[PDB]
Symmetry: D2
Subunit: 234 residues, 4 copies
Amino acid sequence: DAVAVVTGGASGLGLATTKRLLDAGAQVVVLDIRGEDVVADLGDRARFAAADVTDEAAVASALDLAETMGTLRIVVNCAGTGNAIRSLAAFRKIVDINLVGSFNVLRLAAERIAKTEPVNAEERGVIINTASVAAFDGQIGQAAYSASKGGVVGMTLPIARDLASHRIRVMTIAPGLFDTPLLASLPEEARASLGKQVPHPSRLGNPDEYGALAVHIIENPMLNGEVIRLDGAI
Amino acid sequence: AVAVVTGGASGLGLATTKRLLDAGAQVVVLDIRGEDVVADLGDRARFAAADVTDEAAVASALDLAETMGTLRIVVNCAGTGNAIRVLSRDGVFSLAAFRKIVDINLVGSFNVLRLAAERIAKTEPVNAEERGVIINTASVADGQIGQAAYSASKGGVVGMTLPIARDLASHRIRVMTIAPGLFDTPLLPEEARASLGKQVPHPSRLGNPDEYGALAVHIIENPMLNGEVIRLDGAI
Amino acid sequence: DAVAVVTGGASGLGLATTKRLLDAGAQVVVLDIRGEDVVADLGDRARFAAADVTDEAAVASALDLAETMGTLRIVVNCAGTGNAIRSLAAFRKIVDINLVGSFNVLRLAAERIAKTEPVNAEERGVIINTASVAAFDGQIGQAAYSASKGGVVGMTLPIARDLASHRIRVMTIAPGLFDTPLLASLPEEARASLGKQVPHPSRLGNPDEYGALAVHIIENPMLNGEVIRLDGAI
Amino acid sequence: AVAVVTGGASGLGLATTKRLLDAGAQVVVLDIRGEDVVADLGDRARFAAADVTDEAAVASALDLAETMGTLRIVVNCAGTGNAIRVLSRDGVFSLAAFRKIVDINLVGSFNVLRLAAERIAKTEPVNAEERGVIINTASVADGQIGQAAYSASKGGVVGMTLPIARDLASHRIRVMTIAPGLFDTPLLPEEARASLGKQVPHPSRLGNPDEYGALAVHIIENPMLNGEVIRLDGAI
Ligand code: NA
Ligand code: NA
């Protein structure tokens, strides 16, 4: 194929990853809840599947679309929720989207990737998660972001070990402060101030830097069961 | 001093409750059942029926605690107790099961902590250094989806520990987590329980719930333990 | 016996641990490079062995003293070096004392403890390490303290697993900022300022709090292969 | 741009050197031998004989690098290369052996980093964001004392990574660590090498030194990677 599914692929980290994957020659299904126009503009090697990652039936239909395009081998979980702004229902929503959704997509995708022929015939595929944190202290919902981050981190090695016999690697990127629309509710000088708190480089991460790491992980067969912090040492 | 122990009517929570009662705390046992168990514990223990994800029911358990005395201690053992029995009894083989397990562990622990902290923050300190202490339990360990639900739940509880400790520091409430390995609780045949014990390096046996309770009391009694996860697992 | 060996036992964390152990009914060999007077004052259930922990022959002779007193079952590595003050030789000295010394004492003690009868006949003994950090940023020798800390942390689980068949637990305490003579070169208000940086409790740790944890570890059979941070969330 | 690769004449260091040469860097190979290897690498590689714990010899390797161009990159692979061959060839069964292994890993890496950083801090930045990047290797894995020396060495290198990254941030020098698992280097019979490969979950084979080199180059090329340890080990 090779086909990738990128959740949250129509913006931020997901979009940057989608573009890097297209550049690398893969086809991509953008699994997201909006941004059909953005994905249309990328051309017909990227396709849009409308799906909430917490909805099993919706995810399954997006994987079906990927299968029509070629051989499914790659997943990148970049779906997130909640703008950074200065409720048990709110806690639950963040955990459901960032943690449960990532598991849903990982498990359903793994089932299909496991059925493919390996490509020296060593690998069937690679699943990459995103472990996301709160942007700042006293950020609303910090405990939920820390919980869903910890959950994604915690499942990385155990799932890698369970999928080893299927030749599917499982990795996680833990980004720091990145320039995405999730920061767009803060005023500009606030975002600039956040960037300057990062030790080095003292700025916001560019989503392309996340996308570049994701591609490196896909291209490096020895990276498995690991979390990689991508955060300027913050 | 009053404690609330969730999952307090069995296993780790019961062992904790007993240690707390012997140390002079009164205890509200917050659980889905166990009225007889709590009756057998005598006059310094009271029972509150509650699902840890139910805000009103947890609030009422806290109200009960504050009727008995000054609420200073919470130990969240619901993730290992009666509450996960059904969520696990017939196995964990679906995305819906994974979700329910994550819910009780992450949402349940967050609900109990957030509501308890609100009450404890309003108490007077006891060198007038401490208002209280909240201890979480990072899920006890079934198959692959079961392994994932455990590992995600454990991870999430771990992940919240330091950030919440930091948030509550100005309120003089410590936040700690115990991450137990294989323990001998009603949750678990003798041969099958024997095999589990053998994969623990040393001691090569199931943990005694009293060993969990002893650590919980030590955490309570050691002012410098904050924002940390303590694995209690025989190096497994 | 039971006999404990506490390295650095004549001051700070080590002394507080020695006193807690005596109170708990153990006999103690204080393995240290000075403080014979302090140990004399504790009475004849504490004995002094003059030894540098980097010197194998010296350590062995201290273990010999412990054996004459009773059955050796407990080791607490609290020997440290260098006052906190605001050189490759200096880097090497910190690593040699804090990391190599701890390994030296652990390995030599383990050999003897392994030969004892277990005491329901589950345990032969317990070895506790101290993983110490720099007190503040820009502290001279910070990289060496971080290296020797990381080294002690890194060896904890692997050594616990290798000693499991001998029924010897191996644990590590990672203290934060404690009121010991290692801070005595900083002026008082500087130490007070450091204490206030600790989130909660916002003060310097009391060495007795370390000693209490060490005793709890000894008394809790399920604690093995783990590092416990004791640091007020700093 | 000039790089210094310690242990650069074999294994992980050689694979890194080759990747760097293909990416357009000149490379000083700092090693205890390998003049012929470096000659075969051609005119953009030069050889400096040095023990990584020898301040004068490392200083001279740095002098050589700065003669060739602007020093921006250091990759410390000496802990996995020619330098540990003898320290390990006849086994690790003494406290003196443990010490020597810790020395080369912790002291060696600190010596190279501290001296390299002093030079790199004085260069002009290249959006004028970066002066340079230093990458450490957290020991490759023999028996119990061997296991302890490995684990302590790895731990120490890991432990220094973030604090040093923080210290060097104002100088625009990133500090990263790669923690490799079982790799196929000259250090390692086919059957015995086969058995080692099988205990890696996936890929269930020894790592190819080129996979280490590819990660090192990615770290160099990704401005946001700082203060972090990356395990490269097939989930072992
Ligand atoms: Na811990
Ligand atoms: Na990592």
